[PDB]
């Protein structure tokens, strides 16, 4: 349950990643693959090695999707609908990976937004990535 402070919190940290959203995306993916090797089971077709053009492209796509969730915080359901569809019916990623990626993006942000990565903004983004997760795993069954 995103509160108005939470929503604010989130619009300010994210407005700051700004033109770097894509690199933070590719970065959060590389930390996940290294820290949580099981998540690589989903990208058997990707070159997962360092600097992969595949992981890059992919980071951008994920970061683009976050950006749009940020700008529709208010109606994430409708805004992320094509995607819970994709995840639920085609990709079929087990719900537990959503938390692993969430953590990794939290860690990329801390490392890059030293000044804004405040405890209250930390609690907010955490709640944020958690509802994006719920929306994306909402049509699994």
């Amino acid at each position: 349950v995103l509160s108005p402070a939470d929503k604010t919190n989130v619009k300010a940290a994210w407005g700051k990643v700004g033109a770097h959203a894509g690199e933070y995306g590719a970065e959060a993916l590389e930390r996940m693959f290294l820290s949580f090797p099981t998540t690589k089971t989903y990208f058997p077709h990707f070159d997962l090695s360092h600097g992969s053009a595949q992981v890059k492209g992919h980071g951008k796509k994920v970061a683009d999707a976050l950006t749009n969730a940020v700008a529709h915080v208010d109606d994430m359901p409708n805004a992320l609908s094509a995607l819970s569809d994709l995840h639920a019916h085609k990709l079929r990623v087990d719900p537990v990976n959503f938390k692993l990626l969430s953590h990794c993006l939290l860690v990329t942000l801390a490392a890059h937004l030293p000044a804004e990565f405040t405890p209250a903004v930390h609690a907010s983004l955490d709640k944020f990535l958690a509802s994006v997760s719920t929306v994306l795993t909402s049509k699994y069954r």
Partner: protein, 146 residues
């Protein structure tokens, strides 16, 4: 794993009475039905469209039998689940690309199938010995992932 012998014994005795042939088909079919995303791995299996399409698919019934015999071997080497399962661990990883969380879903479904079958005979205590085993088998299978 660290079963206690009265734990090892209670698991052993019950396993004694299991029809592996039918119980494997059941735990595998139930997985596919309660956690439908797990069907991502069995597309060459035909119709998985409804519970009956899954539950009597002869392809599911026959894979279920392979999984439970492997499981069975496991119960004979409780001291050494890891090496028992290492070539199967490497297979699921490197060729099958199976997320290890599926090993945990399966164990839970199997405990559901032991209870459904044994009724009152599957007691809290017997349940606790089996929870340990399925966890031990999921860990042994996840062990060679990289």
């Amino acid at each position: 794993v660290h079963l206690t012998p009265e734990e090892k014994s209670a698991v052993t005795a019950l396993w004694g009475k299991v029809n592996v042939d039918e119980v494997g088909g059941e735990a595998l079919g139930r997985l596919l039905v309660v956690y439908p995303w797990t069907q991502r791995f069995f597309e060459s299996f035909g119709d998985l469209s409804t519970p009956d399409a899954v539950m009597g698919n002869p392809k599911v019934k026959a894979h279920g039998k392979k999984v439970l015999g492997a499981f069975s071997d496991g119960l004979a080497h409780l001291d050494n689940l890891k090496g028992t399962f290492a070539t199967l661990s490497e297979l699921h990883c490197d060729k099958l690309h199976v997320d290890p969380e599926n090993f945990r879903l399966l164990g839970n479904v199997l405990v559901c199938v032991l209870a459904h079958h044994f009724g009152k005979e599957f007691t809290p205590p017997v349940q606790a010995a089996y929870q340990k085993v399925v966890a031990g088998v999921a860990n042994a299978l996840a062990h060679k992932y990289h």
